[PDB]
Structure formats: structure tokens, C-alpha cells
Write a protein that binds this ligand. Structure first.
Ligand SMILES: Nc1ncnc2c1ncn2[C@@H]1O[C@H](COP(=O)(O)OP(=O)(O)OP(=O)(O)O)[C@@H](O)[C@H]1O
Lengths: 298, 260
């Protein structure tokens, strides 16, 4: 740890704090996540165990790099490549002017690439929300925060203490599914795509029932023809209002006929039918993608 | 999970990692105090432990892999062999379980032969020696990949394949020399043959590149293990697989010929 110059706190965590730092010997700029260590009643936290071991297999331009782990006494530091900001602040920053459509398509494209990469290496992100996506002045966007990540070479079970923030939570999880699937990650992405496009959260629920209700009001209440099995799910209620699916033309006004198609496929109810990152990359929506640079107000 | 798009990719990646997670086939010869038998007693005990704590089968397999890897490069004295086993189980629970048992449980299950701090430090040591490379491919994982090729699914076949694969964990004795994809290929064909009388599907042949011929060597071994099972010095697995949860497959009689 002596070769690191702490520059400035850039964040907090349930098990850590993030500082920006500089390597004094190489000058490399980095993000250090510190972990205190229950060297008596816990040891290395489970989040840290999974984040480290999984992230270290995931080297991709669109995934934040874990550069080092300085494990010791009663302190654990994760050392990461460093990026300027997250999509949450960028998005806020862009309220008013809005994020240029070509930049949105670029961001979607890159996130799908990082995701497809994760998926084919059996890692589920499970916490895809604007603040967990980092960006740079060059136009790159990378997946970050693998604190809720899980390898799925063997089915991942749903647990109420490990789950995305509500707004980005898939319908199956809300309806009490037993296992997670790649689809949950594609759902979060569909929601983020719509948010960038409209400047407003897609389904900003107040609670789980409110969340499900907002999804229903927009996509329509799922029936057995749509999602064979819904009516039998653990938190499904026959009392659910029966709403109708609205025009995506009305849901996401600025998106063209192609962008609307991709979106409806990312928001598909049937998790076995929801598009995959791998497949979405094929979508005609990207047949002209480019790599614009953002105007970060750093 | 369930979106066919990545099944191949994941299988291919697992076939690669499996080769790299591999521990030293012959590390036990080069080990001073401990022996294959000491190991067998340890893994068997871990099975109990799993049972006692309701942990997944995957937590068991991982833990075993961490053990055989840690042992291919650190001399351990027989009386510390259990400290290593316990830290491996704790680590595998942290990785795999929804929420692991507390270190307290782990120190408890040792009849207190070890302290909490010894458990934690050994945890740090294992992590260092394994270099945080905990997401290892297992027999269970390959079984899962294979079950997807069942025409049609049979939960009794599955239980059996899970049984045989789990039995392989007990004997470094012959097991350490086969890839997880292989012991899995054999467990699947043996279980399937025993239960439905059918053989290693052509779809699995194309998928894995293994031919029954390829699995023969491991097949013969798994089979002899299956036959000799009721006589084995370790019984935790047989007792566990004779429960309704596992369609009591451990009581299911093994063929006396693979008719290979
Ligand atoms: N590689 C990085 N480069 C720059 N800033 C980063 C980097 N990684 C993380 N940060 C910052 O650390 C911030 C806050 O800490 P933390 O990572 O704990 O993320 P969080 O989403 O706030 O999650 P939680 O508090 O639930 O752990 C992030 O919002 C992010 O801006």
C-alpha cells in the first residue's frame, strides 16, 4: 500500500470506501476500494470473495478492470482502473440538453458487449443500474460493481438480500421466481436505454406492488398466452388489474422504428423469450453505431 | 441462465478453465505426513457437514477442488489437514451459498480442535495460495450442462449421476487423474444406463467430442467404485443418496456389466 498516494474520496460502500489514488512509482491513476476485515467474526466478506474471483476472469474493454488485490492483516484493498464518472450523474448532467441519440446507441452497444462477455463466461451481473456504469471522456462505457455478481455454471437462486434497486428489477423477480437468469440483466439494460432516451426513469415504483403495477400499466398485464406460467408464480394475484400494452411510440417518443423493436425485445415478459445481449448486438438498430465522445462536465 | 444463446460458450469456457484449475495428479506421493486415506476421511466428513448445514452439492465439490489444489503445493501435517478442510468449506460456502454459515459453525464442527483465528488465517492462506481463483469448474457443473441433452429429462437418472460423481470425490486414489468433464461424462452414462438402459447420447458426443470409447477408462473405474460402494470405508455419500430427495438411488443396484 506504500506506493499509493490517496488523491480524494470518490465514494462509500456497505463494506468499503473508494478513493481515487495515484501510483507513486508509475504514476498510474487508480481507484482503491478498501475493506477493513473482520479478522475475528467474518474474515473476507462474501461480496469481496465473489467480486475478486469473478472480476479477475473478466478482462474486456467494456468491463472495469481489477488491477490488483492487496490482501493483508485486517485490511483488503481492491485496485481498479479509474473512470471519470457514472451514467447517473452524466444523465442528470444531461437533463435539458439530453444525451445525443448516437451517443445513446454507442452506450447501449458497448454495454451489450460487456454483458454478452459476462454472460458467456457464466457470470451474472445482477445489479445493473446507471450508477454502476462508468464512462470516460473518450466515449467508453464499462460495467462496474460486481458486488452482487454470481457465476451460473449451476443455477443461481433468488435471495431477498441480494437484488437490484427496484426501478431496474425484472418482473420475474417481482413475481417471486426461484432462479435468476441472464434475462434479468437484459431487463435492467432495457430500462436504462429507455431512461437515456426519455430523461425519465421507465418504471419508477414506490414498492414491489407499485413497481409491478407500473410495468403492467405500460407493457400490459401478463397473461398465460404471453408468459406461459405467470398465473402460477409465487406472487402473482388473480386480483391484479388487467391493463393493456401501450404504444412504444408513446412510451419512447424519440426512438425510431428500429430502436423501438430492440426495446420491446429487451422488455419481453417471458424471460426465456427476452432477447440476449449476444443477439441484441445483431439488431439492425446498431447497423450504423459510432463512437461519439460525451461532454463530461468534470 | 435459461437462454440457449450461451450454452456452448459456457461449456467451452468451462472445458478451458478445467484444465487450468487442475491440481497435481501425483501430489500425494510427494506429501510427508498426510495420505489418500486421510483425505478420504476428510472429504467424507465434509459431506456430513454439508448435510448438517443444508449446503448445496456445489459447495462440496468446490471445497474439494480447493483442497486438492492447496495440497499440490503446501506440505500439511496430518493434524492441520482438517484446518485446511474447514477453511476450504468456509470459502466454498462464501462463494457458492446464498449466505454462508458463520465461522462459529466451522469452529464448532471441529469439536473446537481449532480456534476462530486459526480458521480465519488459514482462510487468508488458502486465498493466497489459490490466488483468489475460486470460480472453478466442477463435476456438478458439467453434469448440469449435460442434463440439458436428455430426451426426455429423468430426475432419477440425474440423482444417480450426481451420486457417482460425488463418490469420485472420495478417492484421490484413482480420481485425481481425470478431468471433471470426464468423470461427469462417465457418471452420466453409467447412471443413465443403469436407470433407463440407454447410452451416452450422440448429441453429447458431438457437444463434448467424447466418445464412449473415450470414457471407457474412467467408466470402468466409476463402475468398480459403484459396485464396491457398499463395502467402502466411507459411507456418508451412500447414506445421503438413499433419501427421498435423491430417489434413494444409492440403493439402486449397479449393472454387473457395462456391456461396453
Ligand atoms: N473505477 C472507478 N473509477 C471512478 N470512480 C469509481 C470507480 N469505481 C467506483 N467508483 C465510484 O465509487 C462510487 C460509490 O461507491 P460504491 O462502489 O460502494 O458504488 P455504489 O453503487 O455507490 O454502491 P454500494 O454503496 O451499494 O456499494 C461509485 O458510484 C463510483 O462513482
Amino acid at each position: 500500500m506504500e506506493n499509493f498516494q490517496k488523491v480524494e474520496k470518490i465514494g462509500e460502500g456497505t463494506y468499503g470506501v473508494v478513493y481515487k489514488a495515484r501510483n507513486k512509482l508509475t504514476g498510474e491513476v487508480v481507484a482503491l476500494k478498501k475493506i477493513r476485515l473482520d479478522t475475528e467474526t467474518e474474515g473476507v466478506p462474501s461480496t469481496a470473495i465473489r467480486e475478486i474471483s469473478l472480476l479477475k476472469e473478466l478482462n474486456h474493454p467494456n468491463i472495469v478492470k481489477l488491477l490488483d488485490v492487496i490482501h493483508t492483516e485486517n485490511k483488503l484493498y481492491l485496485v481498479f482502473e479509474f473512470l471519470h464518472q457514472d451514467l447517473k450523474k452524466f444523465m442528470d448532467a444531461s437533463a435539458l440538453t439530453g444525451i445525443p441519440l448516437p451517443l445513446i446507441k454507442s452506450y447501449l452497444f458497448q454495454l451489450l458487449q460487456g454483458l454478452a462477455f459476462c454472460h458467456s463466461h457464466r457470470v451474472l451481473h445482477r445489479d445493473l443500474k446507471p450508477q454502476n456504469l462508468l464512462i470516460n471522456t473518450e466515449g467508453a462505457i464499462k460495467l462496474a460493481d460486481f458486488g452482487l455478481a454470481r457465476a451460473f455454471g449451476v443455477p443461481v437462486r433468488t435471495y431477498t438480500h441480494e437484488v437490484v434497486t427496484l426501478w431496474y428489477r425484472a418482473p420475474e423477480i417481482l413475481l417471486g421466481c426461484k432462479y435468476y437468469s441472464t434475462a434479468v440483466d437484459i431487463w435492467s439494460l432495457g430500462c436504462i436505454f429507455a431512461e437515456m432516451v426519455t430523461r425519465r426513469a421507465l418504471f419508477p415504483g414506490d414498492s414491489e406492488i407499485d413497481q409491478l403495477f407500473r410495468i403492467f400499466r405500460t407493457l400490459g398485464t401478463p397473461d398465460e398466452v404471453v408468459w406461459p406460467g405467470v398465473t402460477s408464480m409465487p406472487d402473482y394475484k388473480p386480483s391484479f388489474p388487467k391493463w393493456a400494452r401501450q404504444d412504444f411510440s408513446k412510451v419512447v417518443p424519440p426512438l425510431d422504428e428500429d430502436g423501438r423493436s430492440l426495446l420491446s425485445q429487451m422488455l419481453h415478459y417471458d424471460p426465456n423469450k427476452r432477447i440476449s445481449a449476444k443477439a441484441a448486438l445483431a439488431h439492425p438498430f446498431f447497423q450504423d453505431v459510432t463512437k461519439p465522445v460525451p461532454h463530461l462536465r468534470l | 441462465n435459461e437462454v440457449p444463446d450461451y450454452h456452448e460458450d459456457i461449456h467451452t469456457y468451462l472445458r478451458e478453465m478445467e484444465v487450468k484449475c487442475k491440481p497435481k495428479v501425483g501430489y500425494m506421493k510427494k506429501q510427508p505426513d498426510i495420505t489418500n486415506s486421510m483425505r478420504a476421511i476428510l472429504v467424507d466428513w465434509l459431506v456430513e457437514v454439508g448435510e448438517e448445514y443444508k449446503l448445496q452439492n456445489e459447495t462440496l465439490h468446490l471445497a474439494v477442488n480447493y483442497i486438492d489444489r492447496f495440497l499440490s503445493s503446501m506440505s500439511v501435517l496430518r493434524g492441520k489437514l482438517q484446518l485446511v478442510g474447514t477453511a476450504a468449506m468456509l470459502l466454498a460456502s462464501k462463494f457458492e451459498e446464498i449466505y454462508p454459515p458463520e465461522v462459529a459453525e466451522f469452529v464448532y464442527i471441529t469439536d473446537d480442535t481449532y480456534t476462530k483465528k486459526q480458521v480465519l488465517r488459514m482462510e487468508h492462506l488458502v486465498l493466497k495460495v489459490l490466488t483468489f481463483d475460486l470460480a472453478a469448474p466442477t463435476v456438478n457443473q458439467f453434469l448440469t450442462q449435460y442434463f440439458l441433452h436428455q430426451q426426455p429429462a429423468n430426475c432419477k437418472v440425474e440423482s444417480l449421476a450426481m451420486f457417482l460423481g460425488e463418490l469420485s470425490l472420495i478417492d484421490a486414489d484413482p480420481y485425481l487423474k481425470y478431468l471433471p468433464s470426464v468423470i461427469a461424462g462417465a457418471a452420466f452414462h453409467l447412471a443413465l444406463y443403469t436407470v433407463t438402459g440407454q447410452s451416452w447420447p450422440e448429441s453429447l458426443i458431438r457437444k463434448t467430442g467424447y466418445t464412449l470409447e473415450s470414457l471407457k477408462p474412467c467408466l470402468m473405474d466409476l463402475h468398480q467404485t459403484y459396485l464396491k460402494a457398499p463395502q467402502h470405508a466411507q459411507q456418508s455419500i451412500r447414506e445421503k443418496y438413499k433419501n427421498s430427495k435423491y430417489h434413494g438411488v444409492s440403493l439402486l443396484n449397479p449393472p454387473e456389466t457395462l456391456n461396453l
